[PDB]
Amino acid sequence: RQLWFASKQSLTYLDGTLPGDFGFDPLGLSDPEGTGGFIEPRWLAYGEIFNGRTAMMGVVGMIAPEALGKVGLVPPETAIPWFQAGAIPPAGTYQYWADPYTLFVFEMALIGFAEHRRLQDWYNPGSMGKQYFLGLEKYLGGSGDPAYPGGPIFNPLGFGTKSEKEMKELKLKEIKNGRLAMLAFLGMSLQAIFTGVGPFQNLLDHLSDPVNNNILTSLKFH
């Protein structure tokens, strides 16, 4: 257990009881005294895990269109940098099937169904297995931990069965591969601002000739 910037106050409530516990609270936001609203260890852990899980596929989906286009498997029209796909209108756009805004409502309906349905299990676990839901309510029961739902729907293949310590190791792997993705997202967000070129394209410039480094990219052109 490699403690990192652990303070005297933080060591009291940080005792390696949660996966990926290394003891880094240099501000004390996870202190158990005076809790209310959103600041709460269970909610903070859930939020960290969820932001990381989202950031995983966010970073993965922002690189494939450029590399796969370069290798010669996607038409050049589609293969464009991530920030030129319509999410940022002043930085290029593409003509999709319906609209930049009708797609937003279409997406928001489906995502809001899932989010409003997931929020209930956090409040009272197991409450989604009662009311009729076209026959899928007998599977949307839960496990007892909102962060790790499990079940046939969320685990069709039993990769986390017949062992206990292996589950802890998988949780620790998830924490690392989710913490890496958030920093990757931050990096690819800043790189596009300071360079204006696709992140995958920026890799080759440093890989081939490590001369155009950060100092040469400090003038902050358009």
Partner: protein, 742 residues
């Protein structure tokens, strides 16, 4: 440690209390027996300290109420921006500022009130404004009504956020007492996070938005053809065509080549000759330097890492050579009493507002502000009044501290004791100096009036007679006017055109500013100001210092902060309470501020404002009559009030008739207050008895028994209506005069 600790769900959200008026008070919750109850319900509403003796509950209520005030302020700003976007001639004003009058209020056509929609210009009819919003919006780079709409919508959303935050931080998660008493961390956050970063962000906005937009505006470009604000951001060539230093980016900032940025970071001084305001690059450099100063300041106090000065240690270390450590015990006093903090903060804010009023007329910061005479007069007068009121409130709440929180058995302080032990000497010397100043200032005016009436002008105090020149002020003016070159080699021109150095700036054929000369009349009026201020101090200080006892009432602290008297004995004891000292101080504050604004109005109209011809002949509004006529009382009566009241009294039948109506109505209210001030409540209760007999005769006597106003309420109603009437009378006078003749 410095940790965020709260309590969850302290108060349940319910409508039960809304149906029980007086719920907060154990003596009001019963219900009414007389009409007095009703008045009490409104008088004790926000006096949290009297509701309970628990400090934490008081702090929580204070926090929630402050959130409510912020919500209301945001509503006010949203309304201002929406009315600017929807019912104004701002776009037309953008193309001819000197000839068009700003207007953002229009009225509906009923009962003939549509005459108030006056001809302000630019194909628009409405009411002219003096708040100066148009100049502020022009200085921000705003060129379209859509931007104003967006700002108004944002302000509405912020108001909603503040109200919800008040509800949440009271009824759901209320901070603990230790959270409120972390003064070191609060000071660190409010010095660095609030002021330093706020100034940094505004300086960034000025550098990236305001300057390029105002360049096109002053270059003579149609507003609809100006590039949009975001075009200067995602296209640096457009911004570099005006300031070539944007080609090198931020490299000089980190390589310490800051002199490359001298194009838009200057130290000029003076005024821009086109707009008549301060150079924008000077303002940007100012906000940058101020931001650095506050960011450095906000690292002085210790929170969690064992670095930084402790506030208690500083106070307890200074001590005193007078046989004791004087400043020991102030930290405990200042961390356990809301009233003392309120007193100190009110005094500081009130004085700051007066500073703002003085500085904004002499160094006009907005474009096309100096030649809009009505706006200048309005802003100066407004901030003078606000500052006076805050300063009076400081004395009131210091008295509240002395009565309710002072306790030398638990929290002793040596300096407060030493001050309390020579109060006779302090008060007597202040009394004497007031008498001396009154004689040797007002008696000079009396002597001049007598000499002039007797046909002996050669015996007067005047520039052509016995002279009393203000040599020290003239010397300081001369030092400031010649400062550029020796003591401030890096500045091109002085901070203000009023210092000296003969030079005039004219915009649209109107004078903006020029040197202001000082003579015998200025000497006299300045010593009058000194007199009024020293008297106000005498009254308020007497109120605070003798709050607990005196040679007359040994046990006054047992009677409280606010009580009418202690009986007709001892010769008579009316108005011995501290509240009565505040009541008396409000009158002298009114006197002082009224004289200040009259002096300002006459001096500026006589020696500064006016027109200039092609050859350069300055004609003033009142033609330089201040020097000879302001040295007698008859001169103030004849050449200032009688002469300048003509505009307000001739306004009927035009768009300015509302100001005549308000002039008369305010005289009415002022005279109405005297009925409350001169009489007493026994007479009125006796009269009410007779009226109640008649109502009983016809079976219409109410169960809520009518009663006359209490003695304190009589005094309060009196002073409130006196101040409202006087201030509104002067308001109408000023606005009609300056709008019609300026």
């Amino acid at each position: 440690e410095v940790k965020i600790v709260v309590d969850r769900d302290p108060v349940k959200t319910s409508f039960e209390e809304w149906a029980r008026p007086g719920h907060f008070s154990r003596t009001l919750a019963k219900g009414p027996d007389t009409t007095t109850w009703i008045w009490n319900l409104h008088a004790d509403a926000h006096d949290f300290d009297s509701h309970t003796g628990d400090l934490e509950e008081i702090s929580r209520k204070v926090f929630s109420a402050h959130f409510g005030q912020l919500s209301i302020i945001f509503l006010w700003l949203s309304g201002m921006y929406f009315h600017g976007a929807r019912f104004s001639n701002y776009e037309a004003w953008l193309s001819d500022p000197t000839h068009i009058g700003p207007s953002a209020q229009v009225v509906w056509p009923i009962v003939g009130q549509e005459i108030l929609n006056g001809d302000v210009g630019g194909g628009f009819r409405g009411i002219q404004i003096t708040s100066g919003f148009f100049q502020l919006w022009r200085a921000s780079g705003i060129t379209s009504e859509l931007q104003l709409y967006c700002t108004a919508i944002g302000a509405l959303i912020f108001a909603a956020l503040m109200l919800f935050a008040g509800w949440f931080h009271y009824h759901k998660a209320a901070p603990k007492l230790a959270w409120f008493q972390d003064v070191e961390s609060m000071l660190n956050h409010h010095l660095a996070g609030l002021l330093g970063l706020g100034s940094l962000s505004w300086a960034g906005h000025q550098i990236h938005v305001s300057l390029p937009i105002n360049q096109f505006l002053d270059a003579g470009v149609d507003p609809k053809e100006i590039p949009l604000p975001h075009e200067f951001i995602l296209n640096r060539d457009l911004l570099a065509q005006l300031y070539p230093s944007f080609a090198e980016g931020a490299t000089p900032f980190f390589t310490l080549n800051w002199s490359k940025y001298a194009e838009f970071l200057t130290f000029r001084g003076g005024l821009d000759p086109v707009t008549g305001g301060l150079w924008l690059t000077d303002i940007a450099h100012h906000h940058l330097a101020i931001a650095i100063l506050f960011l450095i300041a906000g690292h002085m106090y210790r929170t969690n890492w064992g670095i930084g000065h402790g506030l208690k240690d500083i106070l307890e270390a200074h001590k005193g050579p007078f046989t004791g450590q004087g400043h020991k015990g102030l930290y405990e006093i200042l961390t356990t009493s809301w009233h003392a903090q309120l007193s100190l903060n009110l005094a500081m804010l009130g004085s700051t507002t007066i500073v703002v009023a003085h500085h904004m007329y002499s160094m006009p910061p907005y474009p096309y502000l100096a030649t809009d005479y009505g706006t200048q007069l309005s802003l100066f007068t407004h901030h003078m009044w606000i500052g006076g009121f805050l300063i009076v409130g400081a004395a009131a709440h210091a008295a509240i501290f002395m009565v309710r929180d002072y306790d030398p058995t638990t929290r002793y302080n040596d300096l407060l004791d030493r001050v309390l032990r020579h109060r006779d000497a302090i008060i007597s010397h202040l009394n004497w100096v007031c008498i001396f100043l009154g004689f040797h200032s007002f008696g000079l005016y009396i002597h001049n009036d007598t000499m002039s009436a007797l046909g002996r002008p050669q015996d007067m105090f005047s520039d052509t007679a016995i002279q009393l020149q203000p040599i020290f002020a003239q010397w300081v003016q001369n030092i400031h006017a010649t400062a550029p070159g020796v003591t401030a080699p890096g500045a091109t021109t002085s901070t203000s055109l009023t210092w000296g150095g003969g030079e005039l700036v004219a915009v649209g054929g109107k004078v903006a500013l020029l040197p202001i000369p000082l003579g015998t009349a200025d000497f006299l009026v300045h010593h009058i100001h000194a007199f009024t201020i020293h008297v106000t101090v005498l009254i308020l200080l007497k109120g605070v210092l003798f709050a607990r006892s005196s040679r007359l009432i040994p046990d006054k602290a047992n009677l409280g902060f606010r009580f009418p008297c202690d009986g007709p004995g001892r010769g008579g004891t009316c108005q011995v309470s501290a509240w009565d000292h505040v009541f008396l101080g409000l009158f002298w504050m009114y006197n002082a501020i009224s004289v200040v604004i009259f002096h300002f109005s006459w001096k500026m109209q006589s020696d500064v404002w006016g027109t200039i011809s092609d050859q350069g002949m300055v004609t003033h509004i009142t033609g330089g009559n201040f020097a000879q006529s302001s040295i007698t009382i008859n001169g103030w009566l004849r050449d200032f009030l009688w002469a300048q009241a003509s505009q307000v009294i001739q306004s009927y039948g035009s768009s300015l008739s509302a100001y005549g109506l308000f002039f008369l109505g305010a005289h009415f209210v002022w005279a109405f207050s005297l009925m409350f001030l001169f009489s007493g409540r026994g007479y009125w209760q006796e009269l009410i008895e007779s009226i109640v007999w008649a109502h009983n005769k016809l079976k219409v006597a109410p169960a809520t028994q009518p009663r006359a106003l209490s003695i304190i309420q009589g005094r309060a109603v009196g002073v409130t209506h006196y101040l409202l009437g006087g201030i509104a009378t002067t308001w109408a006078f000023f606005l009609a005069r300056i709008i019609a003749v300026g």
